[PDB]
Amino acid sequence: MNTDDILFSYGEEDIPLKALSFPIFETTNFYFDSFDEMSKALRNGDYEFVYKRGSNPTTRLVEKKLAALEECEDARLVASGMSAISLSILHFLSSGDHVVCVDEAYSWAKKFFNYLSKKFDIEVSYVPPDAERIVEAITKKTKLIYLESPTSMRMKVIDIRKVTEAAGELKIKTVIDNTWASPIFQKPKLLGVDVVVHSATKYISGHGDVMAGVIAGDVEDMKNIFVDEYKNIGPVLSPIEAWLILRGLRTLELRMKKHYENALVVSDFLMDHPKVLEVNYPMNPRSPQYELASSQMSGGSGLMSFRLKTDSAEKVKEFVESLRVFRMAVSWGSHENLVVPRVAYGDCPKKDVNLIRIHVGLGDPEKLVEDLDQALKKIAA
Amino acid sequence: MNTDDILFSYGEEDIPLKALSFPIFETTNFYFDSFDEMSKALRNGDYEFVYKRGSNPTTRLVEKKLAALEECEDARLVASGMSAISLSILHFLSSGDHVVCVDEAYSWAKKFFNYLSKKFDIEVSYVPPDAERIVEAITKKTKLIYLESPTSMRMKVIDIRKVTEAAGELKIKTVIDNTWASPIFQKPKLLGVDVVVHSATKYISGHGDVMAGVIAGDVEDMKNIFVDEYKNIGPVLSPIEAWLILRGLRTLELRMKKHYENALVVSDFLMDHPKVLEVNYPMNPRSPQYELASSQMSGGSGLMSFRLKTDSAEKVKEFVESLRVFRMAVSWGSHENLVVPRVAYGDCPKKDVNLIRIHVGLGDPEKLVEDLDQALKKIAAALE
Amino acid sequence: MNTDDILFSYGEEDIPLKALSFPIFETTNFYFDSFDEMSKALRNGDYEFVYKRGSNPTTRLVEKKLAALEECEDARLVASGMSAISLSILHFLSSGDHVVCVDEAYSWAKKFFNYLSKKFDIEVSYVPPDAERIVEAITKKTKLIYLESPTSMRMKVIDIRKVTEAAGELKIKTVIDNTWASPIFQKPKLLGVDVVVHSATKYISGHGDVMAGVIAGDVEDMKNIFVDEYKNIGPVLSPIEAWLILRGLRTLELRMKKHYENALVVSDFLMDHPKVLEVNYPMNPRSPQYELASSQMSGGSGLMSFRLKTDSAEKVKEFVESLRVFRMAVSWGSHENLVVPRVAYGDCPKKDVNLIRIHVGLGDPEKLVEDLDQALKKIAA
Amino acid sequence: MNTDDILFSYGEEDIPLKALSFPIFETTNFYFDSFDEMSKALRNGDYEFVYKRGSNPTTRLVEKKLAALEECEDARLVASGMSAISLSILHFLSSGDHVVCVDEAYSWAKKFFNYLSKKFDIEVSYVPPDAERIVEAITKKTKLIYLESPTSMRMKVIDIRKVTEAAGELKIKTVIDNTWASPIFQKPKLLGVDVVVHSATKYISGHGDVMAGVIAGDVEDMKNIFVDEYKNIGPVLSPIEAWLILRGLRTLELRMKKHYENALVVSDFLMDHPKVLEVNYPMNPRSPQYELASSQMSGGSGLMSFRLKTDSAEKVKEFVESLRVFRMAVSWGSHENLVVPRVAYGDCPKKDVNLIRIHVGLGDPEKLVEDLDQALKKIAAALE
């Protein structure tokens, strides 16, 4: 299906009372006119409709769109990206199982793996974002391989097909976090991944307000994630926030295109600047990763990082505090132009003392280039 | 603890821009003017403020009010009752542990325990809602006792102090689901429970719209639930819904008192009706459970159940389809007058074919009496 | 109909998709499956549904309830109490017309009358809240009599039936602002008033968040107010706020009863306190107005005023700033316990330098009594 | 004026609690710590903050952004476009005054003028959207000229500078409805208009949900509109909706550029189609109006109209009912692709039986081309 059909019409043929904006079904429950119908609702896995820890008319419309965008059979919205990640992981794991996890996965994904390994008999091997290392860490007990591409902070790309070929051969399940690219620029289901997750907090909502996660994949997986993890743990998204996602989704293609255009300008400037050591933005044609990246992605988002020429946390501090346009904050995926130096985090690797992450928003990239330029001028050569 | 102070003023002395309604902080993030402040935010457990999977100004006000109502040191709002239950359970259990769970706990609580039991090395003993049976099922590996009082569907009360006395002697943690009473009518922290959970979906929001859970307890437990389970699994409540809980809270005492008044009228009617076998409403003074109940609770809510004199599902269907005021729906805790016969559920015990749960709302209880009365007229007398 | 049927079930038999909470129809527009239907929508006065400056499914449910509560045939929700007042006034007036307006009407109602009289050929006589003075001010050109009872600030009651008898005889239209009592405690349509208005900002919403107004009356009046004033001026209420009113309405009877109970306690204390000259709360049995008030009202709300023994704005300031529970703010009608001394206003009459208005909320009235007591002790005898 | 600075940063330097999304101040009121401050609030025109029929922190941020986009000194958000129009009109008119109103103004604007004319001593001259006809209708009692460019339904452009040159010489005030272009593509303040109004219902919100109006202009006018009309008539916008306008504003430039690109494709197709008589889209370079239009506008929106070669309402019905992508609905300004034939309206001029208005949204314009194309195939060729 076309992106535009998905964003602007799919699922919207028949709306209650012929409203054109889908109504917000901010209800816990739904009444029944008959006992028989109520009994069906309380026996079947997914009756439409019975209860908010369950399907919701507003939320389902958005889920239907998101699934179609990821070319998955089904999707579910949940309260956060971490709900999507943690529930997906729980679905695929039991006592005695092993997981291979890329060691540049989002920090809280790794924290969750560590939490399960401390509390239960789950073994985790952390490996670099390198398909060969990933397949080398597979054991006879491996049930899950957890991917992210591009990775967190360092924006490294993995050869996904190489991993999923091996996984598929061995009946090992794969989960990928595709938040960085959005569905506009990468569709990992088509690269053979079983389940795709997003922090919809970032690009899918796009406005730095809603917190939400998406789990997408095949009917069998998603039916079981729904009736087991979702119903038992209950990370329900507010239908008001689902409606806000729908609203945000309308501009997703326009926004992603803008971020890509802007990120090319900013990454080009950073790559050529004498005070920047290196730039991590895999969809710039001059990137060392471009050939692999562009084999898997149709564009890149606004998120990138780069390294200063220093190992001094103090020089990094000088730099970031000198920025007048980029704002110091976490999160990303909106109009906001954001900066975070990795050295701010307690668990920052020593190697990444010099690593700065920026998010390029929806405005005039020359303003961002000038901000970076003036700040770079203020640190010593 | 003063209820009105908590509902109407606690935490509200200083509000951004001197607004009287607390603003809705519907933001993912918060900016920093200083690298040093940002570093503190990204190293410390709970910086105010940095990120939505984190503390939020709107949500934290409501949390502080809820903790104070429960006379607990701290509380967190989460996306549903099941989030409050599941995260609390996970906080207290690891591989090799045992749990005692009352077998009339809310269905999804039991489903979660069974999920854990199937997936990990967690063993669960299910016991009747009887303090003695609960304590008897303790083993040397028991790390959690999971309570609910009154219980789901049957509204059975448990001697909570008898359980917590035993648990505390053995360093076993307790969790209780206090949704039924609300914090107005029961405060199990004062009965020795470690962690109190609610489905704020029900009475605390009170308007059949928001879905939310509450976890409340001591500083140590709550700090760890926050930094471990909440940040890892992320069942974050929308600040918009937090604000709607705040709005609903303002009438919580008024609503709870009205439900209790109404429930007395309805339960009295059912108790005296020839075609009703029995009524499960433990805060009616004629209830067999009243002495124990009234030692732990200062009132009762609108939720009750009763049995018809029958073993026929079809007769229960006849009765429920005859009602014109009560509406067939799940959930409860609002103005809505709701009915669900337990036999509608696939996993209904055989014994509970005749069990009907009703929720008495905020209106004229005589309308509910008349509705029940006209429905009871249309079913046949039981065979003798 | 019973209050409880109105609050809890009227209009809620059939809700889209069987939700029990009425969905929020936050839509500008509605699609049509046929040209014929669209043509009807664009020809008829009130098609269900076509456009948000028009009927809305969410808003209409709340309007239906409000009308039934006021025992009026129809009602409309608008953006503020002043929208309800100003549109009602415009409906009844044209060039060359005269109005009698009670001179203790809400200040902005009087400002609006003054605005019309400056800009257009509208003459206004302001009179005390006294039915005899009101009927004495009627001229052959009088088209409207504007009432409020109890009045603003001074909480005076008018004999409404005496006014409406005379008005009805002369084909003069009446509008009353019934915000003070709420529909729970007074239903002026039953006392013969043509159109009833409320600031739903106050008790009807009840939570100090929504701003909204209600216009209620007969079909003929309301049909014309809708198609003329409402459509031309457009003070549309957000359906999100309508839904919040519906939510608030659920507790309206519980809240009004509580406010009345509390106000009796506080008014009794004020009446007996040696530093209070007089108390304006007409539904206290010891009030000089009680016989008339209780002939028209079934109870009283939380709003009252009282006078200190002083003509010093400074002593009033001392008093109000000494209160630690009552908060200095305008508005009223919620849980909030609020105080405003009339002398704070620029246009405060000299006579009212000593007049304090308080709103008694939903809590323990002894806390309010103790606050007043301690503050009263701190001013000189 | 820098568009991106306005959309993305202006006014957002300091936000309560350092939130990055501005909080929703859904409050009626604000408390005071001091009697003196409360007295200032209740005497002054515009205290920050005191009451919702008043300034609001959320709404004021959006207002300041909108004023800056229009290059006006101040702006106020109100409950609908018609509130912005009606209050602006009332501000400039009193008993005995005359107004010149373009006769292709939005229908409800004309209805309001007629309402005023019927009720009070206000006289109105309706004129074609032609600067010369407008200026010719000026009288010694004219106090207001009411403009809209492009006009409703027919998308006619007016030489605004010719009108404002005349008005300014005679101390006559001008109001213009700039909804069609949005502030991205036309800024009539720079063309000499006194007060600019929008239905933010349409492009400024841009998502077919919020209803809102904007009034923008100089300090003097806006201060008086605020303290007189706005506080007296009270068409207050919900802060929740203000926040949704803020959210919609972030993509305003992206959306407007896309509508323009799409509208060029669709208008080019219609212009070259044998069964279309004419196309009203003044920012297509082949439009007869393009030279005047492009002197005042930097782009065009998605709204256009065109005529079929027919005088038959039934043929227009045939065509519109044949469309499968465009949806029959009023309003415009979002992603929605909408159609309304003017003959659907009861008051449609006879000349406009063949006039069809379409709104081109944010998708693939070729889908719209194909839909129009397949519909045009199914109507008969015009008689010759």
Side-chain angles (χ1 to χ4, degrees), chain B residues 84 122 132 257 324 333 362:
Chain B
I122 297 290
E132 183 53 34
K257 286 184 168 295
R324 290 142 83 71
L362 294 175

Side-chain angles (χ1 to χ4, degrees), chain B residues 23-319:
Chain B
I24 313 172
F25 278 85
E26 180 62 348
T27 194
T28 52
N29 61 359
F30 298 78
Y31 56 94
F32 293 87
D33 292 315
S34 131
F35 167 94
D36 292 338
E37 280 302 306
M38 183 173 211
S39 298
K40 290 183 45 165
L42 295 184
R43 293 165 198 215
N44 291 338
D46 192 8
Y47 185 94
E48 291 193 317
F49 303 89
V50 56
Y51 189 65
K52 208 188 239 197
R53 187 155 43 60
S55 288
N56 176 272
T58 307
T59 309
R60 206 67 189 117
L61 171 61
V62 190
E63 294 170 335
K64 268 50 207 316
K65 294 185 179 285
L66 291 169
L69 279 178
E70 275 290 9
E71 294 187 50
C72 293
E73 290 175 339
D74 196 13
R76 297 284 175 179
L77 278 163
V78 290
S80 65
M82 289 309 305
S83 300
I85 290 165
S86 62
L87 273 57
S88 297
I89 288 164
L90 286 164
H91 167 71
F92 284 127
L93 294 182
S94 58
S95 190
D97 293 345
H98 176 262
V99 37
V100 180
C101 184
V102 177
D103 70 11
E104 301 177 8
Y106 182 70
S107 62
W108 297 96
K110 300 186 296 168
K111 289 177 187 196
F112 184 60
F113 279 122
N114 296 340
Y115 171 90
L116 290 180
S117 188
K118 183 184 170 172
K119 178 174 295 287
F120 299 121
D121 185 11
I122 297 290
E123 308 163 318
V124 182
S125 301
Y126 289 102
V127 295
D130 173 83
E132 183 53 34
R133 296 290 285 284
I134 291 157
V135 161
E136 288 178 12
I138 293 168
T139 81
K140 303 309 179 212
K141 300 183 236 251
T142 306
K143 290 300 208 198
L144 178 67
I145 297 156
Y146 186 95
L147 303 171
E148 186 175 326
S149 178
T151 66
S152 292
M153 283 298 325
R154 293 164 176 186
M155 319 307 170
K156 291 295 174 275
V157 177
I158 302 172
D159 186 343
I160 298 161
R161 288 171 197 106
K162 174 171 153 138
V163 180
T164 57
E165 291 178 67
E169 263 182 339
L170 294 161
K171 302 305 196 206
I172 298 172
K173 301 294 170 178
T174 50
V175 171
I176 191 164
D177 184 333
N178 195 33
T179 304
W180 184 104
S182 85
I184 304 301
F185 288 147
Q186 192 171 231
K187 303 184 190 297
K189 174 51 62 166
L190 300 187
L191 310 176
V193 181
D194 293 303
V195 165
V196 181
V197 295
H198 296 260
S199 178
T201 311
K202 307 291 168 55
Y203 283 119
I204 287 170
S205 136
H207 291 86
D209 46 32
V210 166
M211 174 157 283
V214 190
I215 307 173
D218 301 351
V219 173
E220 182 62 348
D221 287 318
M222 296 305 308
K223 175 193 217 329
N224 290 317
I225 288 165
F226 180 65
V227 305
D228 301 331
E229 285 70 28
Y230 175 96
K231 294 189 183 176
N232 292 350
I233 299 167
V236 175
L237 192 66
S238 176
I240 297 167
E241 294 202 354
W243 183 87
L244 285 174
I245 295 166
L246 183 61
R247 197 182 195 249
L249 267 181
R250 305 309 191 167
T251 58
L252 179 65
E253 182 179 60
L254 297 181
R255 290 182 289 109
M256 297 318 293
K257 286 184 168 295
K258 179 64 156 143
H259 290 290
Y260 186 25
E261 178 183 300
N262 285 352
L264 288 170
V265 166
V266 174
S267 64
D268 274 339
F269 162 77
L270 291 169
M271 290 184 159
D272 298 324
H273 196 288
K275 294 197 176 162
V276 172
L277 179 61
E278 58 99 19
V279 179
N280 311 304
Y281 187 69
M283 288 298 289
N284 185 296
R286 285 192 296 156
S287 160
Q289 313 198 74
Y290 181 74
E291 174 183 0
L292 176 59
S294 66
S295 78
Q296 301 180 151
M297 306 202 281
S298 63
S301 65
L303 198 71
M304 65 183 70
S305 63
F306 62 93
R307 297 176 185 267
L308 296 183
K309 296 171 74 129
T310 190
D311 62 357
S312 169
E314 169 68 17
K315 190 136 142 185
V316 170
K317 173 179 176 178
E318 299 175 359
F319 174 74

Side-chain angles (χ1 to χ4, degrees), chain C residues 342-356:
Chain C
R342 198 174 187 178
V343 71
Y345 292 91
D347 63 4
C348 185
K350 188 222 283 268
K351 154 177 172 68
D352 284 5
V353 165
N354 61 357
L355 183 65
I356 315 292

